[PDB]
Structure 1
Amino acid sequence: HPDISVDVLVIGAGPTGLGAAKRLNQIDGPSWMIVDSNETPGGLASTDVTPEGFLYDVGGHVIASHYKYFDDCLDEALPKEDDWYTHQRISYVRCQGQWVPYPFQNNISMLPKEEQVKCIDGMIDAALEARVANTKPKTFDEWIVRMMGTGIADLFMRPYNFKVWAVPTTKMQCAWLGERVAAPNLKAVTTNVILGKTAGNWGPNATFRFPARGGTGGIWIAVANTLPKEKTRFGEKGKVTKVNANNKTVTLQDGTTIGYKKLVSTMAVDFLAEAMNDQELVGLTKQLFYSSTHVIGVGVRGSRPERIGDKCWLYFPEDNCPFYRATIFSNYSPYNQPEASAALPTMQLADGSRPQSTEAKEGPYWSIMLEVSESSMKPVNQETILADCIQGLVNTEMLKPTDEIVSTYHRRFDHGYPTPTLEREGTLTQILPKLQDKDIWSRGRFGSWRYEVGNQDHSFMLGVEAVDNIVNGAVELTLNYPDFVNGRQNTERRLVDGAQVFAKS
């Protein structure tokens, strides 16, 4: 007999596991337990802090919720109005010396006229082809070209997406982008060119809210804290090392065994196959593709430069920098970096030279957070990536050679993006149903490997819905129908449902 027995064991306390846990706690029916190898819940939605006091998320993390239930849990966890800051969704594409507002194609008037001609011509071709199309695109590349035409494709989405995914766009499927027909809005694009006009897709009603304190990680610490502590096991004492699917027994690193009736595994499915010592599943999961994510963080002295301004996140298609995305993380909260009166020595100048003095000087400070992808098709030199990022900051005019860097951060995350390759679905549909037959709900960004439902709210709800499937026979909508959940307001499920109301009576 196992050391512990529960009805539903949840492996992992990132967003997905915490989702499963929150729903179990609410339902308060079957017995349950959540574990994690980390003392701090949050997984890829965690936050680090440099010794100099600069916070960094695991790359740019911006919440766009598709679910009321998700909002309920964030509100419960961080209920105060000053637990959060609201910002407009401001983003730009760096192209040929210019900060081009997103979406890129509505703003090509910033480019030289010759290129505008090239762009419009390509989109005219794409429009005339769309008018007679009778097939769906089969690759990410085809989808891009049908949406944008060759000129606009070549300038942004093609080179940018290689830098993001670390695989060519021709090797990825496009179904994950949704059911929208791949066709250009030629009139919109041509109008802005003729008018010599720019327009970003943000404004007063296009916002996000970001945690006042502790970065994105502050959310999941708060959410996790609403759980009954005795049902949680976080840290080395909670690391799963073996999974016996036949006995429905899990073994922890310290030797503790847990019996379960249903298992919700939110660890990377390739690691689950290993933990299971399931040779067949190992072979299958190894056919999945992913990229690793390098997060580089740079702490800068001085008030926010005019050239940066209210920019939130930024895209880099060009090859004069290794990062695909930059975030002005200091714009997300005042508390993502030290206060102005905090004294810190200058480590280096942005051109790499030494400071004139090693004295600690006061702020104020601002902060840039960078992402660089890696795969077998796109290697990254760990010894030089920081320096190359900083040079990239100079090249893209985010920093001047004279800017004073006071803090640096670099961490590599092995499983960063699950890749929507052409082969993904053919693989997943062999893996996930075999786990299912063993009463294992493998769910999450790397639990079920689907990027289009791979954000915080999706992950959280994957865990919620998996529990709802286990207990109430609910349809796992987020898992099997990303277009469905992404295209509606999901308002039905709440942190307080009829079931808990009628019961209190």
Structure 2
Amino acid sequence: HPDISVDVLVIGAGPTGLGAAKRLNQIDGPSWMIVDSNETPGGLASTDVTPEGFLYDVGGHVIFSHYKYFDDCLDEALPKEDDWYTHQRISYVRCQGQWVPYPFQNNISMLPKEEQVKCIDGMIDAALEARVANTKPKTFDEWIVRMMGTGIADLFMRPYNFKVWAVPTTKMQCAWLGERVAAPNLKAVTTNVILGATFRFPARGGTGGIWIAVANTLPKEKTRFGEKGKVTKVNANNKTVTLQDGTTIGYKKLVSTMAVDFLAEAMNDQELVGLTKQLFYSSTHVIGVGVRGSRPEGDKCWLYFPEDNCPFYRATIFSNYSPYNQPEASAALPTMQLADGSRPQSTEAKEGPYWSIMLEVSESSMKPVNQETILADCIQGLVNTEMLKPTDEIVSTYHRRFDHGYPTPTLEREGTLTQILPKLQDKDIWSRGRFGSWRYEVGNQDHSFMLGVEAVDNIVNGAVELTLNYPDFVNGRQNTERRLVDGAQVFAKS
């Protein structure tokens, strides 16, 4: 008879685990507890702050929500209108001196006329092949070429995805992209050549403020965050998890949102360790740069970088998302360096206003990253891409490296996962999440939050885990049926 006993134990309090917790706390049936080694909920969707006052999200922001359930939980956490800012859902690709709007292929009119020809010629090839295709694409690279043609593949999606995933497009599967047939809309691309939706963001606290607020709604006594909640052993057969302080938790069902390879190690289950080690992943460097001045003459989006004049694959003007992402203009800060690398003339603390850039650089066994120099190379890439002038004054830098950044959709991934996840299922273990179940396409915040919700919904109410197994299905519909108040709660308060 161990130290604590619960029906469902939730390991991890990132969006996946908090999803499971929100649903367990709504159903309010089986007993439950959620643990996390971090004192602050949010996992990799947390927000850091530099000593100089600049916020940087670790794990991006949602630009589209697929579930009314997710929406209800956000509204509960942040219910006032000035808890949120609304911006347009846009993005750009940096290509040959130009900021090319999304979607790239629909905007190549911005590139030189000679290069437009190369693109259309490639897409005509693709359109003609698609017309007699009778097989589905087998690799990511095949999917790209069949969709965009050689010309448009080489300018953007091919070189870009190598910088993101640190594997060639030929070594990745493509089912994760959807069931949309891989063929081009040739008429759309040429018509635009010839002729020449919002998201909400937290006003305060960055993205990680959402998850603090969502977690606040949980009963504190059913949570255990910090060093007291680090899981060190998992005894699958005794249904016992052991914590670092020696506390033992017994469960009837386990929702594990830690990385499945870490789970395999904590089970001292060498069969699973062997299998998990077959999974490929890339590590992520998040770099933040705080700059003195006003914003460069734009809007609140992500920027993509296929070219090899900067080490990062994506950048954002994080200061455009919210004015509380960086210090107020009256705050005094010394200039740390110039964008060109030189030391400033004066050690004087001057006022702002300030703006802020965030970068991501990926690292893997096939793509090393010089930890000692990457910050400077990024800042240089910011000068090369004309995001920073050589003379801009940098007042804050941020650089953190996350070992498990992206779960890589390799060709082998599904083969390995259908050996890992059913084995854990048979031991009554729902290993779910960005790295709990290792599927990038459902690894952003709304899908992940719902992986936890649906996992609990499967454990209690016999629901199909739709997001886990049918991302295509959930992405192609309005998910309105599951709500933070279902009929069950309405009929019980009578």
TM-score (norm 1): 0.97
Is 1:355 the counterpart of 2:355? The answer is: no
Residues 208-251 of structure 1: per-residue CA shift (max 9 Å, x gap): 10001110000000000100000000000000000000100000
Residues 433-467 of structure 1: per-residue CA shift (max 9 Å, x gap): 00000000000000001111111111111101111
Gap regions ≥5 residues in structure 1:
199-207
Q: Distance in 1 between matches of 2:255 and 2:195?
A: 54
Q: Distance in 1 between matches of 2:6 and 2:124?
A: 61
In structure 1, the partner of 2:411 is 422
Residues 445-496 of structure 1: per-residue CA shift (max 9 Å, x gap): 0000111111111111110111111111111001111101111111000110
Residue 260 of structure 1 aligns to a residue whose secondary structure is: strand
Residue 243 of structure 1 aligns to a residue whose secondary structure is: strand
Residues 102-155 of structure 1: per-residue CA shift (max 9 Å, x gap): 111111111111111111100000000011100000000000000001001000
Residue 26 of structure 2 aligns to a residue whose secondary structure is: helix
Is the 8 Å Cα contact of residues 107 and 197 (structure 1) preserved in structure 2?
A: no
Would the alpha carbon gap of residues 474 and 453 (structure 1) be closer, same or farther in structure 2, given more than 3 Å must change? same
Is the 8 Å Cα contact of residues 60 and 313 (structure 1) preserved in structure 2?
A: no
Q: Distance in 2 between matches of 1:311 and 1:277?
A: 46
Is 1:164 the counterpart of 2:160? The answer is: no
Is the 8 Å Cα contact of residues 59 and 369 (structure 1) preserved in structure 2?
A: no
Aligned-residue offset at 1:304: 1.0
Q: How does 1:294-443 map to 2 (within 5 A)?
A: 294-306=285-297, 309-443=298-432
Is the 8 Å Cα contact of residues 347 and 354 (structure 1) preserved in structure 2?
A: yes
Q: Distance in 1 between matches of 2:444 and 2:127?
A: 32
Aligned-residue offset at 1:323: 0.2
Is the 8 Å Cα contact of residues 258 and 435 (structure 2) preserved in structure 1?
A: yes
Q: Distance in 2 between matches of 1:197 and 1:37?
A: 37
Q: Distance in 1 between matches of 2:300 and 2:183?
A: 29
Q: How does 1:270-285 map to 2 (within 5 A)?
A: 270-285=261-276
Is the 8 Å Cα contact of residues 72 and 484 (structure 2) preserved in structure 1?
A: yes
Residue 417 of structure 1 aligns to a residue whose secondary structure is: strand
Q: How many percent identity over aligned positions?
A: 100
Would the alpha carbon gap of residues 416 and 284 (structure 1) be closer, same or farther in structure 2, given more than 3 Å must change? same
Is the 8 Å Cα contact of residues 59 and 370 (structure 1) preserved in structure 2?
A: no
Q: Distance in 2 between matches of 1:149 and 1:500?
A: 52
Q: Distance in 2 between matches of 1:214 and 1:269?
A: 29
Residues 189-214 of structure 1: per-residue CA shift (max 9 Å, x gap): 1111112299xxxxxxxxx1000111
Q: Distance in 2 between matches of 1:117 and 1:497?
A: 55
Is the 8 Å Cα contact of residues 84 and 202 (structure 2) preserved in structure 1?
A: yes
Would the alpha carbon gap of residues 27 and 59 (structure 1) be closer, same or farther in structure 2, given more than 3 Å must change? closer
Is the 8 Å Cα contact of residues 92 and 311 (structure 1) preserved in structure 2?
A: no
Q: Distance in 1 between matches of 2:239 and 2:343?
A: 59
Is the 8 Å Cα contact of residues 349 and 404 (structure 1) preserved in structure 2?
A: yes
Is the 8 Å Cα contact of residues 46 and 59 (structure 2) preserved in structure 1?
A: no
Aligned-residue offset at 1:60: 3.2
The 10-residue stretch of structure 1 (229-238 or 106-115) with the greater mean CA deviation from structure 2? 106-115
Residue 392 of structure 1 aligns to a residue whose secondary structure is: helix
Residue 92 of structure 2 aligns to a residue whose secondary structure is: strand
The 10-residue stretch of structure 1 (73-82 or 62-71) with the greater mean CA deviation from structure 2? 62-71
Is the 8 Å Cα contact of residues 45 and 207 (structure 2) preserved in structure 1?
A: yes
Is the 8 Å Cα contact of residues 34 and 232 (structure 1) preserved in structure 2?
A: yes
Residues 82-114 of structure 1: per-residue CA shift (max 9 Å, x gap): 000000012110001111111111111111111
Is the 8 Å Cα contact of residues 82 and 203 (structure 2) preserved in structure 1?
A: yes
Residue 318 of structure 1 aligns to a residue whose secondary structure is: coil
Q: Distance in 2 between matches of 1:300 and 1:487?
A: 40
Q: Distance in 2 between matches of 1:273 and 1:241?
A: 11
Would the alpha carbon gap of residues 311 and 397 (structure 1) be closer, same or farther in structure 2, given more than 3 Å must change? farther
Q: Distance in 2 between matches of 1:172 and 1:335?
A: 39
Residues 300-332 of structure 1: per-residue CA shift (max 9 Å, x gap): 0001121xx115110000000000000110011
Q: Distance in 1 between matches of 2:117 and 2:447?
A: 40
Is the 8 Å Cα contact of residues 285 and 401 (structure 2) preserved in structure 1?
A: yes
Is the 8 Å Cα contact of residues 294 and 372 (structure 1) preserved in structure 2?
A: yes
The 10-residue stretch of structure 1 (79-88 or 61-70) with the greater mean CA deviation from structure 2? 61-70
Is the 8 Å Cα contact of residues 12 and 36 (structure 2) preserved in structure 1?
A: yes
Q: Distance in 1 between matches of 2:110 and 2:77?
A: 44
TM-score (norm 2): 0.99
Q: Distance in 2 between matches of 1:330 and 1:297?
A: 11
Aligned-residue offset at 1:356: 1.6
Q: Distance in 2 between matches of 1:231 and 1:12?
A: 13
Aligned-residue offset at 1:59: 4.8
Is the 8 Å Cα contact of residues 321 and 395 (structure 1) preserved in structure 2?
A: yes
Is the 8 Å Cα contact of residues 106 and 188 (structure 2) preserved in structure 1?
A: yes
Is 1:10 the counterpart of 2:10? The answer is: yes
Is the 8 Å Cα contact of residues 324 and 371 (structure 1) preserved in structure 2?
A: yes
Residue 285 of structure 2 aligns to a residue whose secondary structure is: strand
Is the 8 Å Cα contact of residues 273 and 281 (structure 1) preserved in structure 2?
A: yes
The 10-residue stretch of structure 1 (52-61 or 280-289) with the greater mean CA deviation from structure 2? 52-61
Aligned-residue offset at 1:62: 2.8
Is the 8 Å Cα contact of residues 339 and 388 (structure 2) preserved in structure 1?
A: yes
Aligned-residue offset at 1:40: 0.2
Is 1:28 the counterpart of 2:32? The answer is: no
Is the 8 Å Cα contact of residues 57 and 208 (structure 2) preserved in structure 1?
A: yes
Q: Distance in 1 between matches of 2:128 and 2:197?
A: 24
Residues paired across the two proteins, number: 494
Residues 44-87 of structure 1: per-residue CA shift (max 9 Å, x gap): 10000000000001153234210001000000000000000000
Query: Which one of the candidate residues 212, 224, 231 is aligned to 1:240?
Result: 231
Is the 8 Å Cα contact of residues 417 and 451 (structure 1) preserved in structure 2?
A: yes
Q: Distance in 1 between matches of 2:248 and 2:424?
A: 20
Q: Distance in 2 between matches of 1:136 and 1:437?
A: 33
Residues 153-212 of structure 1: per-residue CA shift (max 9 Å, x gap): 0000000000011110000000110100001111111111112299xxxxxxxxx10001
Structure 1 runs of 4+ aligned residues shifted over 3 Å read none
Is the 8 Å Cα contact of residues 45 and 59 (structure 2) preserved in structure 1?
A: no
Residue 7 of structure 1 aligns to a residue whose secondary structure is: strand
Is the 8 Å Cα contact of residues 88 and 197 (structure 2) preserved in structure 1?
A: no
Would the alpha carbon gap of residues 156 and 183 (structure 1) be closer, same or farther in structure 2, given more than 3 Å must change? same
Is the 8 Å Cα contact of residues 59 and 371 (structure 1) preserved in structure 2?
A: no
Would the alpha carbon gap of residues 455 and 197 (structure 1) be closer, same or farther in structure 2, given more than 3 Å must change? closer
Q: Distance in 1 between matches of 2:32 and 2:107?
A: 52
Q: Distance in 1 between matches of 2:422 and 2:294?
A: 54
CA RMSD of aligned residues (A): 1.4
In structure 2, the partner of 1:140 is 140
